């Protein structure tokens, strides 16, 4: 009352309010956030979301400076939390989507979910690593795309509307085309049955057409990694007849190869086992590596490896735990000390079902994917530092220019001597700096 009229009285109150709001954010953001999960992370910060929607809708009823202040330090620790992908809560948000937007495992109701969703929208001002989250959420999609960590597609679509308002724009339509693209996956399964009527091999069941188009450039890193593989004849027919339909449709991206769609095909092959124990992608590929040779050393597999290892450590581990392998080591691929038989035993519920257990692990993977982010954030920082130099002084030469550029950022890191050309090239496009007549090097500044 008094320091609103005593008018500057209030601003001190908003001050130390900002101090306990803030450092309360530091500790309380620091305390129950040891497990780093959506609930705590997202619900400790959305927990204060409760503390101050309920604090500040109340008595409290105006000093809008309180509004911009709670929004200010709230937004600050919105960029002051456990990462530096501090959309980890947004990550967790969609991860919450991940663990909740799932029709079977953790299933809810839309507007049961969507209550939580509109509270996410409450945060939507504050979800703040949108393209960090695009990279990370294309990985999330790699846990979602075929997988189902996003039940409520259209909640995600209204979220997309929100975003492409104030956030990423074509990641949205990228997932759209993916959606309609597995729609087309079913459709060309249909047409394949229509057109080829492909009795190429006797066993046509489930031979491919599942497709989920996110642009080839729309991926967080390179492919779900792939290497050599058997690819029996029907797989030939799949890629080729799809390319029939599809070179009819589109060309330039085509039936590429991508392992992580792979799963296990070990069924009534001819088994005393009545067992169908599907396996993960490279579970499939490396079990493929060990089919007929009733035992195989590290060297026999090492013949046709041309790949990495962990595929087969998952292989022997899932094969011994269930007892589907008469192995010798569960190691990354295998000891040369160790080898490979198809054991008959099984350890789970059904007719050898639920052996489909990719370990489903990253800490070592978490870091590998963190590497991609360094390259895109350094590139952005550099584009701005580069244009700003280029406007200031027009060098501008090619060679000398790149050298001087080197001089300005001695501290940063070691650049490519070549690509110097490309560097100026990048600025040539933006209308930032032009190419002079005088030399392949030594251009001029424009705009």
């Amino acid at each position: 009352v008094l320091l609103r009229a005593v008018s500057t009285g209030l601003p001190h109150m908003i001050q130390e309010l900002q101090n306990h709001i803030h450092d309360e954010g530091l500790r309380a953001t620091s305390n129950l956030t040891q497990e780093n999960m959506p609930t705590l992370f997202v619900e400790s910060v959305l927990e204060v979301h409760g503390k101050f929607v309920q604090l500040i809708n109340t008595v409290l009823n105006g000093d809008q400076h309180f509004m911009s202040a709670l929004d200010k330090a709230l937004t600050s620790v919105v960029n002051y939390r456990e990462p530096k992908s501090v959309c980890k809560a947004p990550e967790l948000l969609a991860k919450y989507c991940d663990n909740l937007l799932k029709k079977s495992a953790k299933g809810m109701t839309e507007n049961e979910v969507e209550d939580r969703l509109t509270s996410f929208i409450t945060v939507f001002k504050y979800i703040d690593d949108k393209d960090v989250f695009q990279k990370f959420y294309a990985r999330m999609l790699a846990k979602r795309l075929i997988h189902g960590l996003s039940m409520s597609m259209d909640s995600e679509e209204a979220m997309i509307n929100k975003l492409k308002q104030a956030c990423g724009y074509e990641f949205t339509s990228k997932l759209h085309r993916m959606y309609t693209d597995m729609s087309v996956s079913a459709d060309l399964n249909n047409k394949f049955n229509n057109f080829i009527k492909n009795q190429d091999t006797v066993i046509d069941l489930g031979i491919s057409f599942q497709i989920y188009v996110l642009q080839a450039g729309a991926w967080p890193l390179t492919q779900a990694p792939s290497s050599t593989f058997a690819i029996p004849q029907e797989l030939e027919k799949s890629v080729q007849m799809f390319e029939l339909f599809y070179s009819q449709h589109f060309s330039g991206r085509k039936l590429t190869w991508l392992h992580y769609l792979c799963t296990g095909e070990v069924k009534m092959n001819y088994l005393g086992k009545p067992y169908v124990a599907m396996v993960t992608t490279y579970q499939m590929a490396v079990l493929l590596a060990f089919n007929n040779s009733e035992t195989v050393s590290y060297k026999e597999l090492q013949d046709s490896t041309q790949m990495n290892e962990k595929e087969l450590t998952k292989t022997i581990k899932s094969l011994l735990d269930v007892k589907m392998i008469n192995h010798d080591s569960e190691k990354e691929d295998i000891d040369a000390e160790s080898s490979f038989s198809l054991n008959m035993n099984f350890s789970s519920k059904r007719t050898k079902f639920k052996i489909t257990t990719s370990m489903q692990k990253d800490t070592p993977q978490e870091m590998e994917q963190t590497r991609s982010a360094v390259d895109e954030d350094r590139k952005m920082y550099l584009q701005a530092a580069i244009v700003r130099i280029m406007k200031a002084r027009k060098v501008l030469r090619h060679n000398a220019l790149i050298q001087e550029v080197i001089s300005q950022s001695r501290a940063r890191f070691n650049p490519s001597i070549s690509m110097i050309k490309k560097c100026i090239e990048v600025l040539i496009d933006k209308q930032y700096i032009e190419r002079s007549q005088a030399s392949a090097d030594e251009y001029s500044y424009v705009a």
């Binding site: 074509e170 085309r177 693209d181 996956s185 091999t201 066993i203 046509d204 069941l205 489930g206 031979i207 491919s208 057409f209 599942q210 497709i211 989920y212 188009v213 642009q215 080839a216 450039g217 029996p232 029907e234 797989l235 799949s238 890629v239 799809f242 599809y246 449709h249 589109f250 060309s251 330039g252 991206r253 085509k254 039936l255 590429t256 190869w257 991508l258 769609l261 095909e265 070990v266 069924k267 009534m268 092959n269 001819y270 088994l271 005393g272 086992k273 009545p274 169908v276 599907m278 079990l287 493929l288 089919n291 198809l342 600025l427 040539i428 496009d429 933006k430 209308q431 190419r435 007549q437």
Partner: protein, 85 residues
Amino acid sequence: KKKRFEVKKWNAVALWAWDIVVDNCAICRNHIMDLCIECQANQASATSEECTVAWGVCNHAFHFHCISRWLKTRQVCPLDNREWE
């Protein structure tokens, strides 16, 4: 027949980029993703991956007077060796 791991039903792979280079109309880098400066000023039907993208009679799918621009840098246009269009 109890194991030799014969064929189950399987699922497959796709794309959709394009059957062209296209490299973002290299004459600048307001991209082929982008309606560039001059050809946001001109702007035919042009989109976030083909602002101009094709293996054309040029095949140098270069923006209107951006293609004209790097034809300015050489009126023989060896860009992909067709005249700026």
